[PDB]
Design a protein around this ligand. Sequence first.
Ligand SMILES: [Cl-]
Ligand code: NA
Length: 129
Amino acid sequence: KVFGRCELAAAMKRHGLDNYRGYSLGNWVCAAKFESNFNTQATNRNTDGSTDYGILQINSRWWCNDGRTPGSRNLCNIPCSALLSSDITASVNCAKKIVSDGNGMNAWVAWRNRCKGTDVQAWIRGCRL
Ligand SMILES: [Cl-]
Ligand code: NA
């Protein structure tokens, strides 16, 4: 599923992301835009052999099991394919674990490089929330 900007904002808000660990909704929408272009089916392979999955590009090195990343952990306790669903519940629940691990949203490279320190409220402007 390819989300619309406001459709995703509303989905994330419903799932408890707004101001989660101090990160306003705009941060999450901005991260999703630049990680996956709002596409739940996005995958990208990393140099180390791990793969990033879904709307928030969650890494199989630490967070999910894809059966092909030797010596990796499965901290969210889910198959990586679950992160590709049109239902974002699994991705959000896992993101909550990631953002709580001490490094905040810096875990997401595109958030650090393209959202951090910008006017992120612009990403939810106009939306009915
Ligand atoms: Cl933080
Ligand atoms: Na893994």
